[PDB]
Design an enzyme around this catalytic site. Structure first.
Site, short mmCIF file in Angstrom:
data_model
loop_
_atom_site.label_atom_id
_atom_site.label_comp_id
_atom_site.label_asym_id
_atom_site.label_seq_id
_atom_site.Cartn_x
_atom_site.Cartn_y
_atom_site.Cartn_z
CB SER H 33 -0.93 0.00 1.20
N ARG H 34 0.88 1.98 -1.10
CA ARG H 34 1.73 3.16 -1.19
C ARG H 34 1.34 4.21 -0.16
#
Lengths: 506, 473, 57, 89, 51, 169, 118, 85, 83
Positions: H33-34
């Site tokens: 998850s950026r």
């Protein structure tokens, strides 16, 4: 030959009649030709899939009746053919000279004899693509047969209409497996029994003509050509010939089985037939499909195999059992043609590469091989008494499946391993040595009853021969009954046990 | 004469398209000649595309081909000189003397593309053929008009054995020999040509025995595709024009099949599943299916194969190794082991030895020789592991007999006139099978094995044994 | 009825506990069996000692 | 048909010259009658055993081997040998 | 002997074909094609008048 | 132009494989029908013509010499490839410098088993050959004997010396 | 809430065990059953038994296996599997777990194997 | 590939996890998850900051326990912590 | 061979050979398998929803120079040539 002169006069008289009734004024002119496919204009009313007679002499099928330019592949070499030569409409769908007379004759694509024996009579010339019998005209596999070589055959039978398949690498001799299977049409067919008759008709789809000669000689010497019509298609032969050949074999199978006698077929290497369909499609105009091969590969393969069946007594209870043979590269079970066909054919016998050099002249992967009918249509000797022996075959194959690197947990596994391994070293029915429905169960029965298993594994290679000869000249009544009575009864089991004691003794 | 006019309209790479006049268009595969400033460009009619336009794949590098060039149809396959006159030189697949030693004044010129012969009158009950190689003349159930190739090592003395085989087969059987290099290197060609001028199977003035029909890489792919057929037709012509049984040697079946694949790709066919194209098989099926045995002799060609990585995952090599009857294990060590030929009959395996197929005496000789050699090989890897003492009485006797077989196996090499001066030596079936049986029968078992090395048949074996045991002590 | 002919010798070997060690009787049994084997081979493999002059000529 | 009749004529009277008349062939120099009928008739025996195949060389079956009816010398030694073998029974 | 007979029989048809080549060359060389042209015309006329 | 003057020289067709790929693109754009590996089959033709250019001339024309240094790209050892196979076969040799030996830190890491220069002897220097005869056997033996990696204590002592020789070479 | 909380848990445990067997198959083949945990070994043995319990005799398949077909009751099957994971028959024979009905037929087959195999 | 190059990340729910009983089946190691915890209620963050590292360690000991043998204190503690988490 | 043939390929077929009044209405030359070619709409905005007279709507993703092709967003049985 004065007879050659008479034949010339008759043929030229037929040609003079043809010329007098040419009835060919607007018939097509071949616009262009190539790769065994000829693009021809005209022919404005040619019925689809009808042979076209071409001026250069070589004929060919007409596949794609495209708008205007009707595409006719050339069923022969192009060096003769040329653009603009007249194209004469044969007026008939491609039909094969078919009938019982073709016996022992090797015929070309449509049925042109190629050995050099002259004409062979005909009992009908039907189209190369017949519609197979549906549901009601079809029936079960109620009559069994023999594959000849034990060849894991009592294990997985090949019954009435059992559409079995094979596989193997190049020069895998799966062709030889077929040849031995055919030779079994001498212990029943060579008698006089139609019910025992399985009039085989091999095929030759794209093989080196030298291999064709080898097949012909092996057929004659063991006296097989009396019961096998081997339609031929040379590698030097043109692509349309090879492509149409399986259809010709289908036609012959119809001409036999449809008559009401139980017949058999064994298509040659069908991978070459697929390559021919690839040439026909990708060369004429048709866009390629999956695996770069033509899209209707499954369609062609089914239309070949689906012709084979076992009709009911409504149609005469005859059958055309088929053994289509497919080839892979690297023994690849996982391939477009191989997997797709294995969906179509009802039986599989996988021939490996290792075992083909590892341990068996047959080298048939017993575990991998399977047939969709083991109970119904199996050798009543191999099931009615030796059904436990069939379950023991499956069990011992599963047993040898785990015999790679596991330890010795107990003695039961080790005993099963040794006995089954002796059995496997035994079961390979030597090449061109079909002799079966006499002591099939004997191997597993003696192994579980401890008659052969006590012998050395290597020595079995002669011990089996001695046991068979002892059954022949000493247990002649019991062995002949096992051949003929159709079952190995508990009393016959006891007499065979006595004969087994005798074999163990001497 | 009616030179059918042409027009060089489209040269799509090597494949060229020439349009001609109606009713004058050459049929498929008819050779077409265009004579540019760089000599003559040969075109084989590739396809008939209609519109009075002929698309062709030239048998030469179409570089410098100009638009508007008129093409004439020679009305047949590739034209090439024929006879024993041209035999023994470098003949361009284009036809002219590539030997540069003078134009081949072979007034008779024979085609290239040929009809396949009549399988009906061929050799179904094919005749056993004696090669001159006793090892291959004893344990190999063979036939006439077939093929055999196990070349293995890449000419490590084999090209020396090649010209020697040419000389011997041209001598005893009274025939010719064809060693055709399809895609053989111009450097490799130079080496082979100088070697043969030194070896005598063909000479600038001396009598020739071998045919050097090489279509090298130095020409267009179509040239590689058709040069092999040019060679096969030359061999068939010289065989049928003198009734001379000619053994044929081929450069590489892989070479020809690959060149044919290249050309077939050039034509316009789509790629197949892996690395093929729409017409893979018919390429090699053009020539090799028409080389069989007739009454005037035989046509039992040989295909030179160096087993690439010794892996059988190439379909052409599999079918070729299936073509051969028995295998001659030409291991490099064996060449130094005592046999100059080193043709191991160890891998002489075949089921054709039947009571009515290979002759009882010949097959028995086969069984004894192969079994002795194989038993020596098997007992080596166990006893020699244990030690030289592991020689049982049976083992010691069998090892002595086997080493006798191996030392005797060599023969003096006829094309080795420069090697050590040994005069020409071979055997014949009448001497071969009987002498092998007798030497295996203990006839000279007491005599030392060193006599067997450099020893041909029993004809001079006894003389050599006497010479060794006499003029030394 | 060649079963009985070797049946006596098979029974003897079954009771040769006093006859074990036959140095040159097993060789004779081998000769007798080889004669029968060659006889059956001549009977089976070789065709009729005749000529198919009815049609072949 | 004229093209059929003329072909039949030129292919029959000439076939007469080739086979149905002993005129050999003027277009082809060597007659097959002086080539095939007798010498190549030995071609059948050239492929066969020459003067031996049609001949079927006389090979009378011989007698099998026996003891030369010798119980003066073989019997006593055989008895002693069998008794010696019986010493480990 | 039988094989020799079979091969000679094939030689017979081959020689017949070889002489047939000369026979065909005679047909063009002799202007019986003139005598053939009227026959062709009559046959074609009959064919067209057939239906 | 250098060679026919009779002199010597060395050409380096560096990474001929990429040149072949360029030919593949050229064929595709020029609409030449695609074939195996989708490059036009003419790739082999162009490569052969470009490769057979150089050799040692005879005394007839003055004996010019020229050495080729072509390179290729083993796509995972792309042995079944078309361009790599043609590059190998056309060359009078295959010094197949596989990556693995380079990955052990070696800058010039040829493969011992794979390299077989057919006409090398005709160019070999004899003094080097005198020692390289034993080097070849040492390499072959090292390859043959390194199989028993996990059973080396029981291995023959002469085999251990052979392994020592292979490692040292 | 579809076929029962117990059924859902039984299926979850069975799938977890079989997934454990597949996950450990690599190390099992590479090293052996002894080289891993006795907990892991026990789970592997139970999973092998369970997989060998997955097959059954089907009424029309009697052509192949030869046994008259067996239709395992859903509740009976769930209980049998819960037991087999729970070791209520973990000492029964593996070959007596293939091509039988419920765990009752499994025990009957184990007794039959005790009679025959011995 | 295009979505994973354009999307925010992934919860690459591999089939082995869902087969391993962990339903839902976020294969934590294969997840990504950026955005991350910066887009999260910190109440979660105080425990997730250790949860992520504990799952990471469990990934480090998964092979060690796959061998099914003993080890040091840190390794066994990590395995128990990871399995429990 | 004096030249080449008359042509190689084509784009339009019908034979009015006159002025274009199909700027708002279209001609459905090719229609089938959920994709339909339309003749007309000389200057349509690309990817404009378009209604086939039979009763099924459509969006026009293809605006090839000759004919513009519009996806037939529904069961195609209602559409027909020339509608």
């Amino acid at each position: 030959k004065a007879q050659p002169t008479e034949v010339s006069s008759i043929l030229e008289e037929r040609i003079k009649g043809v010329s007098d009734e040419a009835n060919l004024n607007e018939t097509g002119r071949v616009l262009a030709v190539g790769d065994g496919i000829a693009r021809v204009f005209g022919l404005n009313n040619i019925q689809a899939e009808e042979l076209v007679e071409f001026s250069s002499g070589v004929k060919g099928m007409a596949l794609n009746l495209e708008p205007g330019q009707v595409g006719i592949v050339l069923f022969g070499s192009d060096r003769l053919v040329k653009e603009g030569e007249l194209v004469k409409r044969t007026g008939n769908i491609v039909d094969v000279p078919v009938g019982p007379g073709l016996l022992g004759r090797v015929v070309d694509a449509l049925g042109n004899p190629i050995d050099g024996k002259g004409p062979i009579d005909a009992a009908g010339r039907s189209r190369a693509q017949v519609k197979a019998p549906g549901i009601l005209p079809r029936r079960s596999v109620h009559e069994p047969v023999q594959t000849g070589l034990k060849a894991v055959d009592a294990l997985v039978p090949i019954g009435r209409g059992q559409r079995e398949l094979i596989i193997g690498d190049r020069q895998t001799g799966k062709t030889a497996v077929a040849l031995d299977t055919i030779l079994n049409q001498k212990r029943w067919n060579n008698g006089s029994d139609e019910s025992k008759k399985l009039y085989c008709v091999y095929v030759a789809v794209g093989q080196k003509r030298s291999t064709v000669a080898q097949l012909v000689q092996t057929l004659e010497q063991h006296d097989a050509m009396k019961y096998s019509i081997i339609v031929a298609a040379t590698a030097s032969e043109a692509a349309p010939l090879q492509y149409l050949a399986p259809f010709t074999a289908a036609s012959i199978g119809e001409w036999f089985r449809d008559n009401g006698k139980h017949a058999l077929i064994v298509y040659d290497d069908l991978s070459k037939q697929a390559v021919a369909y690839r040439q026909l499609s990708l060369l004429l105009r048709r866009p390629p499909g999956r695996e770069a091969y033509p899209g209707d590969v499954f369609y062609l393969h089914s239309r070949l195999l689906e012709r084979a069946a076992k009709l009911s007594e409504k149609e005469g209870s005859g059958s055309l059992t088929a053994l289509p043979v497919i080839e892979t590269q690297g023994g690849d079970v996982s391939a477009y043609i191989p997997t797709n066909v294995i969906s179509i054919t009802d039986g599989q016998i996988f021939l490996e590469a290792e075992l083909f050099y590892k341990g068996i002249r047959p080298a048939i992967n017993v575990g991998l091989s399977v047939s969709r009918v083991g109970s119904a249509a199996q050798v009543k000797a191999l099931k009615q008494v030796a059904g436990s022996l069939k379950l023991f075959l499956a069990q011992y194959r599963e047993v040898a499946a785990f015999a790679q690197f596991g330890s010795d947990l107990d003695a039961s596994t080790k005993q099963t391993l040794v006995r089954g391994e002796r059995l496997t070293q035994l079961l390979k029915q030597n090449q061109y040595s079909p002799l079966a429905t006499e002591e099939q169960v004997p191997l597993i029965y003696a192994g579980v009853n401890g008659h052969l298993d006590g012998i050395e594994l290597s020595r079995i290679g002669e011990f089996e021969s001695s046991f068979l000869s002892y059954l022949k000249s000493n247990h002649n009544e019991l062995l002949t009954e096992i051949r003929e009575k159709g079952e190995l009864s508990k009393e016959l089991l006891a007499s065979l046990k006595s004969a087994t004691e005798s074999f163990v003794a001497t | 004469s009616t030179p059918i006019t042409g027009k060089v309209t489209a040269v799509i790479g090597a494949i060229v398209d020439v349009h001609f006049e109606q009713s004058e268009l050459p049929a498929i595969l008819n050779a077409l000649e265009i004579k540019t400033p760089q000599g003559k460009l040969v075109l084989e009619v590739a396809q008939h595309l209609g519109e009075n336009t002929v698309r062709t794949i030239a048998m030469d590098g179409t570089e410098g081909l100009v638009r508007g060039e008129k093409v004439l149809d020679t009305g047949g396959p590739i034209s090439v000189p024929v006879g024993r006159e041209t035999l023994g030189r470098i003949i361009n697949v284009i036809g002219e003397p590539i030997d540069e030693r003078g134009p081949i004044k072979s007034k008779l010129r024979k085609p290239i593309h040929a009809d396949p012969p009549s399988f009906a009158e061929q050799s179904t009950s094919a005749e056993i053929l004696e090669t001159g190689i006793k090892v291959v003349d004893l344990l190999a159930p063979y036939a006439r008009g077939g093929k055999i190739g196990l070349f293995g090592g890449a000419g490590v003395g084999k090209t020396v054995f090649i010209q020697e085989l040419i000389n011997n087969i041209a001598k005893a059987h009274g025939g010719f020999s064809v060693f055709t290099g399809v895609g053989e290197r111009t450097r490799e060609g130079n080496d082979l040509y100088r070697e043969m001028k030194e070896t005598g199977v063909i000479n600038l003035e001396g009598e020739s025995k071998v045919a050097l029909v090489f279509g090298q890489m130095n020409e267009p792919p179509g040239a590689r595709a058709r040069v092999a057929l040019t060679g096969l037709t030359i061999a068939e012509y010289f065989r049928d024009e003198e009734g001379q049984d000619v053994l044929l040697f081929i450069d590489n079946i892989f070479r020809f099949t690959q060149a044919g694949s290249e050309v077939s790709a050039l034509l316009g066919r789509i790629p197949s599943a892996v690395g093929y194209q729409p017409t893979l098989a018919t390429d090699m099926g053009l020539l090799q299916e028409r080389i069989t045995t007739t009454k005037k002799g035989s046509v039992t060609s040989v295909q030179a194969v160096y087993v690439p990585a010794d892996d059988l995952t190439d379909p052409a090599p599999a079918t070729t190794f299936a073509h051969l009857d028995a295998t001659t294990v030409l291991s490099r060590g064996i060449s130094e082991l005592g046999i100059y030929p080193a043709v191991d009959p160890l891998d002489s395996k075949s089921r054709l030895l039947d009571a009515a197929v290979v002759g009882q005496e010949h097959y028995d000789v086969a069984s004894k020789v192969q079994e002795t050699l194989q038993t020596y090989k098997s007992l080596q890897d166990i006893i020699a592991i244990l030690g030289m003492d592991e020689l049982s009485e049976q083992d010691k006797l069998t090892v002595e007999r086997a080493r006798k077989i191996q030392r005797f196996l060599s023969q003096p090499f006829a094309v080795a006139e420069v090697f050590t001066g040994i005069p020409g030596k071979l055997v014949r079936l009448k001497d071969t099978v009987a002498s092998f049986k007798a030497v295996l029968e203990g006839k000279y078992d007491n005599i030392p094995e060193h006599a067997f090395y450099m020893v041909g048949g029993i004809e001079d074996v006894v003389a050599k044994a006497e010479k060794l045991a006499a003029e030394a002590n | 009825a060649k079963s009985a002919a070797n049946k006596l010798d098979w029974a003897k070997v079954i009771s040769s506990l006093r006859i074990t060690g036959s140095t040159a009787t097993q060789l004779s049994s081998f000769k007798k069996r080889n004669d029968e084997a060659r006889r059956q081979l001549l009977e089976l493999q070789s065709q009729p000692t005749e000529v198919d002059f009815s049609h072949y000529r | 048909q004229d093209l059929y009749l003329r072909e039949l004529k030129d292919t029959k009277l000439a076939p007469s010259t080739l086979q149905d008349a002993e005129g050999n062939v003027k277009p082809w120099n060597p007659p097959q009658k002086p080539n095939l009928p007798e010498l190549e008739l030995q071609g059948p025996e050239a492929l066969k055993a020459y003067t031996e195949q049609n001949v079927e060389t006389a090979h009378v079956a011989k007698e099998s081997e026996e003891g030369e009816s010798e119980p003066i010398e073989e019997d006593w030694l055989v008895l002693d040998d069998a008794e010696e073998t019986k010493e480990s029974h | 002997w039988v094989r020799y007979e079979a091969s000679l029989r094939q030689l017979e048809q081959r020689q017949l074909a070889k002489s047939v080549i000369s026979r065909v060359q005679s047909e063009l060389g002799n202007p019986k094609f003139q005598e053939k042209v009227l026959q062709q015309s009559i046959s074609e006329i009959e064919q067209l008048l057939s239906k």
